Amino acid sequence: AIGPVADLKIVNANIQPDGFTRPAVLAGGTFPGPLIKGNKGDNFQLNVIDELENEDMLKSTSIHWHGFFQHGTNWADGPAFVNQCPITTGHSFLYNFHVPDQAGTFWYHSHLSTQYCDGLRGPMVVYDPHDPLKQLYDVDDESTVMTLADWYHTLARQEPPGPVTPDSTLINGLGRAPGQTTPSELAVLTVKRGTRYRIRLINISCEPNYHYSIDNHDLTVIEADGVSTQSLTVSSLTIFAGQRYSFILNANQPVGNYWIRAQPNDAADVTFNGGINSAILRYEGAPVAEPNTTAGPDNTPLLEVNIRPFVFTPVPGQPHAGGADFVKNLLFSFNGTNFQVDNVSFVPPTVPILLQILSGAHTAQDLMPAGSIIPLPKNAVIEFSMPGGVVGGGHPIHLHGHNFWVIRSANSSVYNYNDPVIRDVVNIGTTGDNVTIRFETNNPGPWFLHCHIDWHLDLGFAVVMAEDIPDAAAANPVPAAWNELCPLYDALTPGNQ
Numbered sequence: 001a002i003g004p005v006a007d008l009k010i011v012n013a014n015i016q017p018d019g020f021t022r023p024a025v026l027a028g029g030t031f032p033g034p035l036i037k038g039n040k041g042d043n044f045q046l047n048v049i050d051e052l053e054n055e056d057m058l059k060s061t062s063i064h065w066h067g068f069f070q071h072g073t074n075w076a077d078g079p080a081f082v083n084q085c086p087i088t089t090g091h092s093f094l095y096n097f098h099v100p101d102q103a104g105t106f107w108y109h110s111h112l113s114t115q116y117c118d119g120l121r122g123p124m125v126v127y128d129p130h131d132p133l134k135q136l137y138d139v140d141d142e143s144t145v146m147t148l149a150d151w152y153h154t155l156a157r158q159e160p161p162g163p164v165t166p167d168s169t170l171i172n173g174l175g176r177a178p179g180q181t182t183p184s185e186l187a188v189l190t191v192k193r194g195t196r197y198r199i200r201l202i203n204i205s206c207e208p209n210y211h212y213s214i215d216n217h218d219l220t221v222i223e224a225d226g227v228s229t230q231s232l233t234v235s236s237l238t239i240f241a242g243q244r245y246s247f248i249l250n251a252n253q254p255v256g257n258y259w260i261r262a263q264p265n266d267a268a269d270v271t272f273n274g275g276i277n278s279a280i281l282r283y284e285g286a287p288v289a290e291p292n293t294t295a296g297p298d299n300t301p302l303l304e305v306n307i308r309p310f311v312f313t314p315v316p317g318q319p320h321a322g323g324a325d326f327v328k329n330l331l332f333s334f335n336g337t338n339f340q341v342d343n344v345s346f347v348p349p350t351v352p353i354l355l356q357i358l359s360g361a362h363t364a365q366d367l368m369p370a371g372s373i374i375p376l377p378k379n380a381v382i383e384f385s386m387p388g389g390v391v392g393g394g395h396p397i398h399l400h401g402h403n404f405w406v407i408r409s410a411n412s413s414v415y416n417y418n419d420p421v422i423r424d425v426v427n428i429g430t431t432g433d434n435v436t437i438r439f440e441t442n443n444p445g446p447w448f449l450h451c452h453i454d455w456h457l458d459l460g461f462a463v464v465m466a467e468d469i470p471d472a473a474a475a476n477p478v479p480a481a482w483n484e485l486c487p488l489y490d491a492l493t494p495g496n497q
């Protein structure tokens with residue numbers, strides 16, 4: 001692991017995580033990137049050093065620390081042309097921020113175009129030495145972070161028009177693609193019999209959700225997207241792009257090898273044929289062999305409606321629909337080629353939105369592209385409904401700068417104004433669903449809200465929450481290096497970008 005103070009080199013390398021060799025964009029030269037870590041309260045100083053040379057996957061980059069509120073450090077959030085210009089190759093940029101009020105499972109990823117799909121994504125954990133769930137498990141460390149990643153044999157920027165589908169699922173960086181004549185290497189999570197582990201499960205994919213289970217073991221879910229939850233023991237869960245769950249794995253079964261199953265909603269092959277979409281849970285002492293186990297009846301799946309925060313955390317505003325200061329029904333649509341939010345497809349501006357603000361924008365209405373701006377008042381309760389229906393999912397919608405109470409989840413008619421889950425990525429489901437969330441505006445600056453299916457983001461599925469803009473410049477003082485980003489980036493030719 002690295003951090004809270006570390007360099008992060010961003011490099012090109014050729015890899016074959018599912019047996020197929022291809023070039024990639026890799027944090028620390030590995031897929032996934034190294035685990036970045038710290039304790040609650042730490043100052044992260046992550047010096048991102050861009051050494052990219054392959055134009056096909058972009059040589060510039062920009063990193064976002066997914067789920068961190070970045071209060072007073074909006075400039076370190078990462079989204080290209082919202083919070084910064086991309087870092088240029090041959091240069092570095094220091095993301096310098098604190099995590100005073102969060103402890104949980106997070107991750108980091110490129111937030112420039114579709115680059116994270118090409119490999120730049122890794123896990124990031126903020127440990128709590130006073131974690132109230134500490135007494136539920138024995139081991140919680142780098143070995144217990146588990147990433148679920150889609151993987152594509154075509155480079156992201158070379159993907160043809162229309163729906164993109166992954167070639168394989170990589171668990172902790174390995175997995176099999178369909179069609180192999182000799183099976184490639186499976187990831188192995190090794191466990192000691194009688195030991196309880198906190199598995200920190202992260203879906204770092206560009207697209208699929210995974211129906212996840214472990215043969216012969218139940219999962220006791222204790223965290224969702226950074227926020228500790230009441231324990232809920234389940235037979236499987238479904239985890240969308242960008243979401244996290246911690247669960248307790250109790251290694252209480254006989255010594256053996258057990259299949260960890262991560263079944264993507266969409267991919268070249270969604271089955272477990274040939275041990276694809278799988279990894280191995282190996283008890284110490286078990287043979288170096290594949291599991292021979294089978295999945296159970298799956299009678300108690302995790303349902304988002306059932307997840308409750310560990311610390312009771314009431315819903316702000318009044319406990320009825322529209323009971324908040326600013327209330328908006330977000331209309332997501334697809335026009336045949338592009339996504340739109342409230343009839344506008346996101347087009348990144350040449351001047352990043354925070355630079356527009358520091359250059360003198362008085363308010364949200366000065367910001368461009370104006371059609372993608374939602375002004376939010378300061379110190380208020382916000383309620384967004386986001387009815388499902390637009391093609392492509394199953395859309396995991398994510399808000400930057402905030403997490404939110406999920407009043408109403410997909411596939412549920414329930415409005416919970418009492419003790420809904422708090423998270424930062426939520427599936428909006430499909431036509432008939434009306435996921436509804438609330439959050440509070442205690443964080444001035446421009447914050448992205450977007451679908452976390454990266455292909456949909458590229459096709460414009462995004463809007464900017466322009467929060468307390470009159471205070472945003474003063475609330476987010478920037479370092480000199482951040483002022484040099486746009487001059488360096490704009491000096492490049494198209495395309496040496």
Ligand SMILES: *[C@@H]1O[C@H](CO)[C@@H](O[C@@H]2O[C@H](CO)[C@@H](O)[C@H](O)[C@H]2NC(C)=O)[C@H](O)[C@H]1NC(C)=O
Pocket residue numbers: 321322327328329385386387432433434
């Ligand atoms: C999703 O929920 C929103 C919020 O309740 C619904 O929009 C509201 O609908 C009521 C009932 O017609 C109106 O009186 C409100 O003015 C609307 N609120 C807002 C902020 O627009 C919306 O209709 C629901 N959509 C679906 C598809 O169920």
Ligand SMILES: *[C@@H]1O[C@H](CO)[C@@H](O)[C@H](O)[C@H]1NC(C)=O
Pocket residue numbers: 335336337338345
């Ligand atoms: C859809 O919207 C995009 C983005 O505004 C526009 O350029 C495109 O031509 C539209 N496609 C169709 C089929 O209208």
Ligand SMILES: *[C@@H]1O[C@H](CO)[C@@H](O)[C@H](O)[C@H]1NC(C)=O
Pocket residue numbers: 303411
């Ligand atoms: C909705 O939930 C029910 C019961 O919890 C489940 O059986 C069903 O498969 C779900 N429906 C959809 C459309 O996802």
Ligand SMILES: [Cu+2]
Pocket residue numbers: 064066109242398452
């Ligand atoms: Cu993200």
Ligand SMILES: [Cu+2]
Pocket residue numbers: 064065066067068398399400401
């Ligand atoms: Cu994020």
Ligand SMILES: [Cu+2]
Pocket residue numbers: 392393394395396451452453456457461
């Ligand atoms: Cu989407």
Ligand SMILES: [Cu+2]
Pocket residue numbers: 064111398400448450
């Ligand atoms: Cu994002």
Ligand SMILES: [Zn+2]
Pocket residue numbers: 152153154165166167
């Ligand atoms: Zn492919």
Ligand SMILES: [Zn+2]
Pocket residue numbers: 361362363366
């Ligand atoms: Zn103005």
